Paper text:
Fcγ receptors are cell-surface receptors for immunoglobulin G (IgG) that play pivotal roles in humoral and cellular protection against infection. The hFcγRI is a major immune receptor expressed on the surface of macrophages, monocytes, neutrophils, eosinophils and dendritic cells. Human FcγRI is a 72-kDa transmembrane glycoprotein that recruits monomeric [name], IgG3 and IgG4—but not IgG2—with high affinity (KD ∼10−9−10−10 M). Intriguingly, hFcγRI is the only receptor displaying a third immunoglobulin-like domain (D3) of unknown function.
We determined the crystal structure of an optimized version of hFcγRI in complex with the Fc fragment of a humanized [name] (rituximab) at a resolution of 1.80 Å. A dimer of Fc binds asymmetrically to a molecule of hFcγRI. We designated these surfaces subsite 1 (interacting with chain A of Fc) and subsite 2 (interacting with chain B of Fc). In hFcγRI, the interface in contact with Fc is composed almost exclusively of residues of domain D2. Remarkably, two-thirds of the binding surface of subsite 1 involves interactions with residues of the lower hinge of Fc (Pro232-Ser239). First, residue Leu235 of the lower hinge of Fc chain A is buried in a deep hydrophobic pocket of the receptor. The buried surface area (BSA) of Leu235 alone (186 Å2, 99% buried) accounts for 25% of the interaction surface of chain A of Fc, and suggest a critical role of this residue for binding. Second, because of the high resolution and good quality of the electron density maps of our crystal structure, we identified eight well-defined water molecules bridging Fc with hFcγRI. Essentially, domain D3 undergoes a rigid-body displacement of up to 11 Å and a rotation of 19 ° with respect to D1 and D2 at the hinge formed by residues 185–187. In contrast to the elbow-like conformation of the lower-hinge observed when Fc binds to other Fcγ receptors, Fc adopts a linear conformation when bound to hFcγRI.
Residue numbers in the entry:
A (entry chain C): 21 to 45, 49 to 282
B (entry chain A): 232 to 446
C (entry chain B): 235 to 443
């Protein structure tokens, strides 16, 4: 399925502003646009809103040539002094989020505050945006901002959700410590996907102390064929996405092997 | 690169004395400040419990010392309506605003409490002066909206000053009013009266007298 | 225009009027960023620099900005003689330093007359009665008023703000509420007033049945 890109990337815009939606994937210039589950009478791979209005607010989806239908982007068009713009309303952990305290008519505000759930968390003398390069669930919340122009003005709140993909793993062993020399032991890097991600596999690696035991591989198990005394130590693992955007480690487990 | 900002609106209640006497004309006043030369046109709409009314008057605008305009709309309100808690909304439309500003005002909320009114003569120590102070203590009242005057022999006595209402420890308000008179007017037995207008008084009015005892 | 803001506050009147106290001027700097470097203070008394101010570390506020306070002790007679106190605040976030100046209210002092008034006879029907202290004719408006009885502070009182009287002086009233039985038993109450123009900056007036 396709992917909609916004230029500028803000999902919330003021009345009369412009934004260009880009339907992206090679090939066919015959794009179908959907606004609110419903096709639109233009069909370039770019949809330009020249001067935003309440009629542009809603759910956008796109189909180009032969691909599937984008996941939907919700564009909202507002009136107000200050708008807390975000690059996405719903993200998976690992993905970046940009936030902007945007003044009406591009007017100047200074001493800007960003808030999450009613609590200010960042102050700038000069109006700057915020980027969280690697979100996680704890960045979920209702964001707003305030800034000083001729007076102090405050934006309305906007809800952002960041979804956990998999909890941090737990390293387990197939036998209770201490175990006898010669015993086989299987270590397992245990976690589970929290979201349906059809072709998605996690990759696992195993450590003893700071030492690499086995590098990144699709197996979540590591076999010690015949335990020896020298295997006594602390064991842990990492679980990652294929591309390493989410990478989490386990606590260390104490494993003792007796002679 | 201009600072973000537009006009501001202040909305004012009637004067207490105007609300309390059915013969007077109470008004609410919607004041718009910082109107620029660039966007000078201001439109008012007014609502009473949500229903639009059309009888407000706009005053001729006035350029202020800082080269912005002040624009005022006045809406006469009915005696009974203001006293029975009706809500008065001023909506102000102007191009420098991203959307119209709406402000709402009504009488203060909470159970009305009757003023107790006490007159106090001058302190013995003050009797050495040429002028003496006659005191009116008005306490226990709610809301803080009140008017106080003095009179003698049916004429207003105007040489007085009254403190603002002050919040007391039980949630009610008090104030004091001080009437300054020539000592000889006191010493001659002239009778002075403190009169109070408040919504928790019977007929919205009471009066207490103060004079030097005869004989 | 985006930097910290400066507020300079006077001493409390009571501290200026009791020689056992330590009156202070307070220079407060708000909207300091975590990333701003040290907020620096220079202090002047009538234009002469002094070095005995106490400047506190920055304190994080609930809105994520920082607040810094510098306090300069002022001498009793300096303040009352009208010396001027200047705070100068410097910092990278301020393109130019911000200066604020403060002094006692100017103009010829006039001492209050203080009168105590007993409860009205009509109020005797109540369980609590009002004891009044009239304080009139004073200038400037800085003043402090308290009540006592038998060596203890009476705390159930409220005092009006100063009100401008028709001769350009100020007055106020203070109201002490007491149980009627305490009044009727002949206990003695005192209204204590501190103002610069009084001898040694204070007087006390009693009131009893
Ligand atoms: C450009 O200049 C203009 C003009 O400058 C000003 O005037 C000149 C001459 C110079 O002196 C200059 O120094 C002055 O600055 C500037 O205009 C001013 O702008 C400010 C804000 O920047 C306004 O400030 C608000 O003032 C309110 C009080 O206003 C009354 O009192 C002041 C004196 O104290 C008067 O000057 C005003 O005119 C107001 O006076 C009242 O007017 C009423 C209407 O006419 C009268 O009632 C009517 O009377 C008639 C008969 O005459 C009939 O009886 C009618 O029936 C009746 O309706 C009334 O009697 C009269 N009263 C008096 C005493 O004279 C403050 O209330 C308000 O405070 C609120 O908002 C603040 C935000 O700024 C906030 O901090 C406060 O907390 C407070 O907020 C409220 O708080 C309460 C309780 O605390 C809450 O319950 C509320 O919920 C909350 N609400 C809000 C919204 O927050 C402001 O301080 C100022 O009024 C205005 N002046 C004028 C003359 O219009 C302008 O700013 C300049 N611009 C720039 C960029 O510089
Ligand atoms: C981030 O947060 C911070 C912190 O906020 C605080 O906490 C949060 C949770 C909220 O609760 C918030 O409301 C709290 O205030 C914010 O910081 C604040 O920033 C604002 C401005 O943006 C400051 O506003 C000024 O307030 C002045 C009055 O301040 C006193 O009163 C308030 C209570 O009303 C207190 O909150 C303050 O702390 C001040 O209190 C006084 O503090 C003194 C110093 O400590 C005390 O005196 C000392 O006391 C000790 C005893 O402890 C000894 O006695 C010492 O000897 C003595 O020195 C004093 O007792 C205490 N009083 C009280 C009652 O507690 C206002 O004066 C000022 O108004 C002027 O400036 C305005 C411009 O902003 C202008 O519009 C006004 O009209 C006025 O202008 C003046 O006009 C008058 C004429 O009327 C003239 O005299 C002047 O010449 C003229 N000058 C100027 C320059 O204009 C401001 O409103 C606020 O004080 C400050 N709070 C604190 C705690 O520092 C910050 O803004 C936030 N940032 C963001 C981005 O959100
Ligand atoms: C989402 O993303 C955000 C950022 O985008 C994440 O927030 C960050 O969370 C970090 C991880 O907790 C946090 O780091 C902490 O920062 C503080 C103070 O600023 C610091 O003291 C912490 O240092 C300890 O932890 C690190 C490893 O995490 C150690 O390397 C370091 O040596 C410190 O270790 C101690 O405390 C640990 C318990 O926390 C012990 O395990 C460790 O043995 C050691 O213990 C002792 O010393 C202690 C005192 O230091 C003592 O009390 C104890 O008795 C032992 O003697 C740490 O680095 C970031 O500050 C935070 N960033 C922000 C901006 O908030 C967030 O977690 C993400 N959320 C989710 C849900 O994933
Ligand atoms: C697409 O559908 C949404 C959702 O029904 C419409 O948004 C609603 O319409 C107006 C604002 O335009 C408001 O009354 C509602 O609060 C909105 N509903 C919700 C749940 O947010 C939107 O108008 C539709 N877009 C178009 C172009 O028709
Ligand atoms: Zn303002
Ligand atoms: Zn002009
Ligand atoms: Zn009536
Ligand atoms: Zn009535
Ligand atoms: Zn004296
Ligand atoms: Zn002295």
């Amino acid at each position: 399925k396709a992917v909609i890109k916004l230029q500028p990337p803000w999902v919330s815009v003021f009345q009369e502003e412009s934004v260009t939606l880009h339907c992206e994937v090679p090939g066919s210039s015959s794009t179908q646009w959907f606004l609110n589950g419903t096709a639109i009478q233009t069909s370039t791979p770019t949809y330009h809103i020249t001067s935003a209005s309440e009629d542009d607010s809603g759910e956008y989806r796109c189909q180009r040539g032969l691909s599937g239908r984008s996941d939907p982007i919700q564009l909202e068009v507002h009136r107000g002094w200050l708008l807390l713009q975000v690059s996405s309303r719903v993200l998976t952990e690992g993905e970046p989020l940009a936030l902007r305290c945007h003044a009406w008519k591009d007017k100047l505000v200074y001493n800007v505050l960003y808030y999450r759930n009613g609590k200010a968390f960042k102050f700038f003398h000069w109006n700057s945006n915020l980027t969280i390069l690697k979100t996680n669930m704890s960045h979920s919340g209702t964001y707003h901002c305030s800034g000083m122009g001729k007076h102090r003005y405050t934006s309305a709140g906007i809800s952002v959700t960041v979804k956990e993909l998999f909890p941090a793993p737990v390293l387990t062993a197939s036998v209770t410590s201490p175990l006898l020399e010669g015993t086989p032991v299987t270590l397992s890097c245990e976690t589970k996907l929290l979201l349906q991600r059809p072709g998605l596999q996690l990759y696992f690696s195993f450590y003893m102390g700071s030492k690499t035991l086995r590098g990144r591989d699709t197996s979540s198990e590591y076999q010690i064929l015949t335990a020896r005394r020298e295997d006594s130590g602390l064991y842990w693992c990492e679980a990652a996405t294929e591309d390493g955007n989410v990478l989490k480690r386990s606590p260390e487990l104490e494993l003792q092997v007796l002679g | 690169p201009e600072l973000l900002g537009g006009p501001s609106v202040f909305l004012f209640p009637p004067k207490p004395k105007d609300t309390l006497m059915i013969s007077r004309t109470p008004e609410v006043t919607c004041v718009v400040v910082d109107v620029s030369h660039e966007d000078p046109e201001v439109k008012f709409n007014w609502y009473v419990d949500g229903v639009e009314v059309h009888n407000a008057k706009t005053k001729p605008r006035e350029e202020q010392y800082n080269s912005t305009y002040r624009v005022v709309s006045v809406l006469t309100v009915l005696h009974q309506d203001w006293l029975n808690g009706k809500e008065y909304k001023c909506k102000v439309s102007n191009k420098a605003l991203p959307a119209p500003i709406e402000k709402t005002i009504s009488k203060a909320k909470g159970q009305p409490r009757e003023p107790q009114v006490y007159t106090l003569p001058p302190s013995r120590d003050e009797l050495t002066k040429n002028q003496v102070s006659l005191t009116c203590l008005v306490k226990g009242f709610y809301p803080s909206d009140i008017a106080v005057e003095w009179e003698s022999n049916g004429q207003p006595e105007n040489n007085y000053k009254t403190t603002p209402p002050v919040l007391d420890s039980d949630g009610s308000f008090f104030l004091y009013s001080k009437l300054t008179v020539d000592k000889s007017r006191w010493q001659q037995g002239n009778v002075f009266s403190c009169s109070v207008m408040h919504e928790a008084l019977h007929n919205h009015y009471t009066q207490k007298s103060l004079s030097l005892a005869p004989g």
